[PDB]
């Protein structure tokens, strides 16, 4: 406590009653003539001190400071995801205890926990003889951490692993799990530091905190500054000289991450660190967004309209990919305007995105695989693929990523529908070229071949299937025909009912002869068949026969409606067939006028058929809650409907204070 060291790198005096030795060192480092005055041994000592202070990043005193720059460089394979290089280094013959300590960290990182445990035990055995206190202490710590991880993993796998994986997985044997349990009996990490020789205690006190059950409590408590609002009206700026709360917090986070990763400490895989990173990043993003909003409100939108409060780079992207789940990223997105945040160093994040693709292809194309490594890898892969939406990518990288995602990713964590949303997020920044269109066609062909078996059936969590893929491919390419699917159609036969229906779903992608042959296998004979075809089968136009069927149905329902007036009884209803016809007529799908005679049965039907004379006192605002963008625009266009909808929306917004109705009102009708 003789001085203060600041994250900017400048040192200040504090509570020191003596000679300012640090100031003299800085002057000596500044004066090459003062250095030559020193002795030879002192010269070598000064050179070593200068090298150390330079690597650490201490520059000079605060008063002699200036426009100091800052950058983050973590020189560790664990933070670069260089799996092949790590494996090759493991395969090498460790030349030193330091080569053995890094190798054990890599082995634990790669999922071979037992091998890492053995290596750590060997290093602990050798260190005490070697008189390497630091490595001995850190290896004890890491071995205990690995043991805790092993026990928790065993419990998790034996509890729920057998279900999610579809089969009980035995990552660890029984004799080894007994051996570790017998070795680590009554072992207490708490006293590890106190038993050391007092020279080690006097020297390496700064490492004692690695023995505590929890650290980073002061770092988490210091986050409260980022939430202050008074600073916005008037920012004191007294937290640090030349830096604000954002800068100090971010630099502290970088220092923590660098210290934990560059020394190969096996604490970077526990829940506390993940929570710390999540909290810090989320608070920083929220503060930046709030500052931008306040600046926009205060001055004109011409200034700060899209200011970049929290700029994202390679380090930020990798940290968010590694330390966030899907739900956390969703919360971050809904909380803030991510699209407004530009991303820097795209070539690096792109390399990481296409680099995550190669590793996943290796993992799942090959039969061999590690359970723990897969568990810790798939979350990162999914997070990175989700967050790659806002990043521009090259054609080759996009194609490789698309292939890896579509073909090599296990259905276990994705689905027809789950995969679809992933692709569309990629399409919003890089419009579909021909290469990935061909890849999508190949995927569709494969999943079409999958339908030959009777028992095969697609499963989706959001109702999205290959039909959507066929729609997407056509959206970007109006004129497209799949020759492979066309020849599949031309070789089709009646008994292939599953394939017949699945291909009916993909009718637009076919050729003329193929689609003629397919439609020769099905027909419509009733209003129910017509609706089934429109839903599945893609009936494009309402032929006069279809309208005649509709008219017959409405007249039959008119007779039934008269008999219902006679009854005065109505048990229940499920789906209104009439409202669909009314909206179709409103959309100019049914050109006949006979349906106008059958008016007065359903309020929605009358409203959508004859808006001008409709009694708007019968209108239900909840009806608006189901209409889609196209229908909302069409309704807004209509003059007879616009002002009544405006009034009902105004009343609902004033009273209900519901955000959905307000959003509709601002988006479409005003």
């Amino acid at each position: 406590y003789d001085y203060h060291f600041e994250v900017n790198g400048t040192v200040v005096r504090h509570k020191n009653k003596g000679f300012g030795y640090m100031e003299r060192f800085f002057e000596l480092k500044e004066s090459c003539d003062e250095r030559s005055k020193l002795s030879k041994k002192q010269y070598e000592r000064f050179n070593a001190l200068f090298n150390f202070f330079e690597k650490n990043g201490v520059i000079c005193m605060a008063k002699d400071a200036g426009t100091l720059n800052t950058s983050i460089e973590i020189n560790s394979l664990a933070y670069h995801g260089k799996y092949d290089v790590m494996k090759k280094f493991i395969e090498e013959q460790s030349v030193s205890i330091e080569d053995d300590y890094k190798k054990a960290f890599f082995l634990a990182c790669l999922g071979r926990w037992e091998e890492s445990y053995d290596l750590y035990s060997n290093i602990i055995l050798n260190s005490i003889d070697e008189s390497n206190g630091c490595v001995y202490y850190l290896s004890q710590i890491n071995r205990y951490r690995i043991y805790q991880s092993i026990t928790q993993a065993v419990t998790q796998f034996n509890g729920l692993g057998l279900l999610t994986f579809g089969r009980h997985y035995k990552p660890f044997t029984d004799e080894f799990l007994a051996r570790i349990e017998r070795e680590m009996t009554n072992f207490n990490i708490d006293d590890l530091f106190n038993g050391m020789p007092f020279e080690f205690q006097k020297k390496y006190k700064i490492l004692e905190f690695l023995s505590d059950n929890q650290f980073l409590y002061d770092d988490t408590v210091k986050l409260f500054e980022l939430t202050n609002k008074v600073r916005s009206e008037m920012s004191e700026g007294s937290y640090s000289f030349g830096m604000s709360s954002d800068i100090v917090v971010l630099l502290r986070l970088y220092d923590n991450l660098r210290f934990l990763y560059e020394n190969c400490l096996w604490s970077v895989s526990f829940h506390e660190f993940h929570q710390y990173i999540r909290n810090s990043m989320s608070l920083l993003i929220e503060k930046a967004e709030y500052e931008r909003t306040r600046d926009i409100d205060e001055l004109g939108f011409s200034f700060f309209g899209k200011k970049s409060g929290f700029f994202m780079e390679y380090y930020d992207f990798v940290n968010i990919s590694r330390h966030f789940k899907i739900d956390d990223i969703k919360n971050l997105e809904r909380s803030c305007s991510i699209d407004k945040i530009r991303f820097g160093e795209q070539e690096k994040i792109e390399e990481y995105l296409v680099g995550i693709a190669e590793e996943i292809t290796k993992q799942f194309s090959a039969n061999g695989m590690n359970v723990v490594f897969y568990t810790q890898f798939i979350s990162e892969a999914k997070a990175a693929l989700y967050f790659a939406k806002y990043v521009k990518l090259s054609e080759e990288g996009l194609g490789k990523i698309v292939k890896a995602l579509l073909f090599y990713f296990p259905e276990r964590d994705l689905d027809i529908g789950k995969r679809y949303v992933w692709l569309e997020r990629l399409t919003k920044c890089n419009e579909l070229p021909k290469s990935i269109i061909s890849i999508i066609d190949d995927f569709l062909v494969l999943q079409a071949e999958k339908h030959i078996d009777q028992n095969y059936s697609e499963v989706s969590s959001n109702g999205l299937y290959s039909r959507d893929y066929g729609a997407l491919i056509k959206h970007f390419e109006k004129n497209f025909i799949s020759k492979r699917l066309s020849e599949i159609t031309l070789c089709l036969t009646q008994d292939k009912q599953k394939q017949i229906d699945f291909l009916f779903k993909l009718l637009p992608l076919l050729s003329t002869n193929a689609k003629s042959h397919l439609l020769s296998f099905k027909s419509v004979e009733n209003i129910n068949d017509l609706m089934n075809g429109i839903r599945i089968g893609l009936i494009d136009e309402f032929t006069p026969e279809h309208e005649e069927l509709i008219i017959e149905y409405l007249e039959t329902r008119k007779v039934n409606y008269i008999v219902e007036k006679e009854k005065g009884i109505q048990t229940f209803s499920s789906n209104d067939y009439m409202s669909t016809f009314g909206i179709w007529y409103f959309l100019e799908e049914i050109n006949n006028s006979k349906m106008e005679e059958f008016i007065g049965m359903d309020d929605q039907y009358d409203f959508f058929v004859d808006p001008e004379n409709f009694d708007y006192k019968k209108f239900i605002p909840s009806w608006l809650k189901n209409y889609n963008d196209k229908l909302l625009g069409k309704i807004a266009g209509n003059k007879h409907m616009k002002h009544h909808v405006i009034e009902v929306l105004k009343e609902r917004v004033k009273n209900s204070n519901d955000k959905r109705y307000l959003e509709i009102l601002m988006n479409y009708f005003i």
Binding site: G463, D468, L538, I539, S574, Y577, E589, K625, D658
Partner: protein
Amino acid sequence: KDTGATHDLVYHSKINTFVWDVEFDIVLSDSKELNKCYFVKCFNPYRINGKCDFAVSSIDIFSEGKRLLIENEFNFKITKAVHVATSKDVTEIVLHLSERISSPFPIVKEVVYLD
């Protein structure tokens, strides 16, 4: 009205629909019988579509624990509903609530927000 099972019910005004953990036995069109049927809605208002698509929400039906596909006109008439926690007296609540909500399928199990 007061019960311990109702504490799991939620209301989403975005769709004006109720969400709860209940399974139903149904008879459709007075000609088909199905047991342990539950449904799930997915809010995808801005989804790729043609001229005949008019709804922001898509509903899917699952009889028992498997997907159910039906082409015959969809008629619905409730006969029995039961909570997963083995709680009864929910049929009257379901009927009453469904009567309050004019939206189709007033009660479901899960809601998925894709937008």
